[PDB]
């Protein structure tokens, strides 16, 4: 306890000196700004000065300013000699306090002689006692290293945010206290309230670095681990954790990287039953991977294999809780695979540009497992996409097959095929690469053309749509949404048409216009 108090005193003194030194360096930089702005006789020298150590990235500026530790860079650093000497004196004082350089004259020496004497007197038979004394001796001998390890946890805040900071700490304390207790209804409600308060706190999204230092994402991850291991027994717990994690991803980019570091677990636990939840670990992974080029490029093919395997399983067997509710069985599960196809679309397409490596891996996995297409586009079934779409139209039309409606299998068929077509469309190679003549790009485009014929695409594009009409007197009759064909499907298919096949002849253009 006393050693911990000493460490806390050291880090607080360091923070106070950091405040004072930051104030002095800001004043000096403003003074130098004024001096250089007034004296700009040398154009080239002024330009070079403005480029380096002048209105630059702040971290780069402070890193270059604090470089006077080296003798060569001491002259390069424009900091005043008094400022440099102040920093050197503080560094020397920190070394002296840490002990870097016979009656015990300090706690460090006293504890060191204590541990040595106790070890020498006898043969200690208590493993816990032995571990305690040797850990204490290690802490006494390693003073500067302990402070070095402690610095990442240190953080500095403004005086006006102390109240909200205390409230956030209290909520986090409730969250941590609920960990050791076995999960129940009351504990569940308390975690929901705590997560809600954390999300509503303004400091939470204003200091993502401080949140990451506190490691709250790890704590909510452990809560999610516990609830997922339990089952869903606590679907409110799972949904709240997923929403909090998605918001944490959306806050910033380094948060997204920290969430991406745990990608494998989320995809492994992403299942059909767990994925039918409103907020899922699959959604968390999608948020952690979406709209980040380097994160998409760092994707391992094992995760893609796992999600493709889940898609293949969903396309193989029917939906368990759907047939339990009593909806007619199609022999396969489109709604489960819709989520997987969305995840693959996010993985492949970023910032409106197709990732070549990810697209190639995905298309090779899909052609390797030909059971991911269901009845239509099947190696064995060979069912035309247009025929399948019209069959689903009539299935949605007749309540005998549509009814077990909360879930419409007729609309699920359309959604699954639209997602598949959209994914294959965004997996298409770029036009500049095609013009350059890359063999892999040409092969991928040829494979996509082979899988999806153009005639079937233009046929479904030309398929009719129901138009609202006030057939009843004074009542405006509309098509039943989430149960009938919608223009989003046509949008995805025409995205495929533009990406893969495209428009090349006016004749074809005019035709497509008329159809």
């Amino acid at each position: 306890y006393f050693c911990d108090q000493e460490l806390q005193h050291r880090v607080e003194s360091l923070a106070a000196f950091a405040e004072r030194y930051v104030d002095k360096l800001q004043a000096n930089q403003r003074s130098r700004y004024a001096l250089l702005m007034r004296a700009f006789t040398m154009s080239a020298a002024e330009t070079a000065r403005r480029t380096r150590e002048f209105r630059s990235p702040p971290q780069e500026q402070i890193n270059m300013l604090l470089h006077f530790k080296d003798e060569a860079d001491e002259e390069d650093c424009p900091l005043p000699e008094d400022i440099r000497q102040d920093l050197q004196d503080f560094h020397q004082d920190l070394l002296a306090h840490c002990g870097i350089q016979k009656k015990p004259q300090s706690l460090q020496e006293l504890v060191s002689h204590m541990v040595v004497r106790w070890a020498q007197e006898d043969y200690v038979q208590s493993p816990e006692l032995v571990r305690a004394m040797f850990s204490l001796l290690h802490r006494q001998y390693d003073g500067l290293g302990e402070l070095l390890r402690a610095l990442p946890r240190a953080y500095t805040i403004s005086p006006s945010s102390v109240e909200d900071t205390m409230s956030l700490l209290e909520c986090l304390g409730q969250i941590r206290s609920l960990l050791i207790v076995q999960m129940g209804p009351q504990e569940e409600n308390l975690m929901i309230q705590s997560i809600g308060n954390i999300m509503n706190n303004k400091v939470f999204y204003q200091h993502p670095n401080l949140m990451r230092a506190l490691g709250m994402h790890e704590t909510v991850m452990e809560v999610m681990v516990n609830v997922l291991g339990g089952g869903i027994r606590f679907p409110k717990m799972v949904t709240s954790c997923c929403r909090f994690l998605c918001y944490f991803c959306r806050i910033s980019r380094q948060n997204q990287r920290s969430m991406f570091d745990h990608l494998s677990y989320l995809l492994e636990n992403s299942g059909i039953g767990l994925g039918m939840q409103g907020s899922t670990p699959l959604d968390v992974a999608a948020a952690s991977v979406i709209d980040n080029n380097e994160l998409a490029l760092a994707l391992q093919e094992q995760d893609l294999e796992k999600v493709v395997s889940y898609l293949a399983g969903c396309g193989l067997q029917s939906c368990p809780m759907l047939l339990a509710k009593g909806y007619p069985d199609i022999g396969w599960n489109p709604c489960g695979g819709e989520r997987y196809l969305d995840f693959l679309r996010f993985a492949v397409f970023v910032n409106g540009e197709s990732v070549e490596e990810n697209a190639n891996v995905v298309v090779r996995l899909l052609i390797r497992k030909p059971e991911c297409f269901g009845p239509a586009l099947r190696g064995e079934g060979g069912s035309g996409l247009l025929a399948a779409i019209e069959e689903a139209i009539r299935i949605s039309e007749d309540p005998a097959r549509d009814g077990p409606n909360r879930v419409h299998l007729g609309h699920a068929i359309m959604s699954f095929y639209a997602a598949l077509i959209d994914l294959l469309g965004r997996c298409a190679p770029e036009m500049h690469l095609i013009q350059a003549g890359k063999g892999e790009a040409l092969r991928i485009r040829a494979i996509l053309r082979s899988l999806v014929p153009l005639d079937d695409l233009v046929g479904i594009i030309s398929l009719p749509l129901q138009i609202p009409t006030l057939g009843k007197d004074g009542a405006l009759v509309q098509p039943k949404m989430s149960a009938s064909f919608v223009p989003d499907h046509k949008a995805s298919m025409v995205l495929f048409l533009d990406r893969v096949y495209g428009i090349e002849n006016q004749d074809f253009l005019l035709h497509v216009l008329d159809v």
Binding site: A18, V22, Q29, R30, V116, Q120, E121, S158, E294, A298
Partner: protein, 316 residues
């Protein structure tokens, strides 16, 4: 962008990070040798002990015995232990000072001999207390799982066995033959199987990501340390240990490290051939390719040296 326009607290945090990166980290302080020397001394217990010179173990002996107890404790998987990592680093540095020495310089024969004697003494201060068995127990308990624990254990073993210490080699061989275990060699084989080779897909991804802004050969230090450890085990032309690595008589199952080493070298050769095929078209090799080639060639150099040691001394 100016610091004065930047808010005070954010500037303070950035200054904390800058000071951490620039001053505290770069500062160097040596305490391993002093602390090991202080721990080695028994004090007055041996002064008052008359029947036995030292019946009660000295503090360093108690520490290594505690770590050996933790290693021998039946655990399904080895867990992270910062205390063990730090302590192993301390002892490794203390015994590696003399090996590291702590321009066509003509070192005298006497100077070389005293340096070797100092290294032997510093290695004795640890292997006369249980480190030679602690390293084996830790490697067996790793269960062929890569991590900082096995990395620290391998570094400690290399530091102990540096220079081909016949005494420590005999101690490890006697312990292995007495306990008659397969976990040590199973873990060693698993660690070899879980090594790394050059990856062209990773290289292309890294180049593209860096352009639009090393992973193509990681664990290079780990694999070089593993093969250096094997070479030290066979060092000195000890036919007993060489034959033991080939076949482990007495044990129910034997693992052929010699063949395993050869197998790995092969995989590395295939990776280097793939890299050559990739860079054969281009006129000039870029800096990233040069770095990758240097890494792979250094690893291959280690593997060759290990194989030489296995057979150097006539071993039919």
């Amino acid at each position: 962008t100016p610091l004065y326009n930047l808010p005070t607290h954010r500037a303070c945090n950035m200054f904390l990070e800058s000071y951490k990166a620039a001053w505290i980290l770069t500062e160097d302080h040596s305490f391993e040798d002093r602390m090991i020397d202080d721990l080695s001394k028994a004090g007055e217990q041996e002064e008052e002990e008359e029947e036995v010179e030292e019946k009660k173990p000295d503090p360093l002996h108690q520490l290594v015995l505690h770590f050996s107890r933790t290693a021998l404790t039946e655990k399904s998987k080895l867990d992270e232990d910062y205390l063990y990592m730090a302590y192993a680093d301390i002892m490794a540095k203390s015994c590696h000072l003399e090996e590291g020495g702590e321009e066509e310089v003509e070192v005298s024969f006497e100077e070389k001999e005293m340096e070797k004697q100092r290294l032997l003494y510093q290695q004795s201060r640890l292997h006369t207390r249980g480190a030679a068995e602690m390293v084996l127990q830790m490697i067996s308990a790793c269960k062929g799982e890569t991590g900082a624990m096995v990395s620290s254990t391998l570094k400690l073993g290399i530091s102990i066995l540096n220079g081909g210490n016949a005494e420590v080699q005999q101690k490890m061989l006697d312990y292995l033959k007495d306990k008659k275990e397969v976990g040590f060699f199973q873990s060693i084989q698993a660690l070899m199987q879980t090594c790394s080779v050059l990856d062209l897909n990773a290289f292309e991804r890294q180049n593209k990501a860096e352009g639009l802004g090393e992973k193509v050969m990681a664990d290079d230090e780990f694999t070089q340390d593993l093969f250096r450890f094997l070479q030290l085990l066979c060092e000195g032309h000890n036919n007993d240990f060489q034959n033991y690595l080939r076949t482990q008589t007495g044990n129910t199952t034997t693992i052929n490290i010699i063949i395993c080493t050869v197998d790995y070298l092969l995989r590395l050769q295939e990776s280097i051939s793939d890299f050559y095929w990739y860079y054969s078209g281009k006129d000039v090799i870029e800096e990233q390719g040069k770095r990758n080639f240097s890494k792979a060639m250094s690893v291959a150099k280690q593997v060759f040296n290990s194989l030489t040691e296995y057979i150097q001394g006539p071993c039919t």
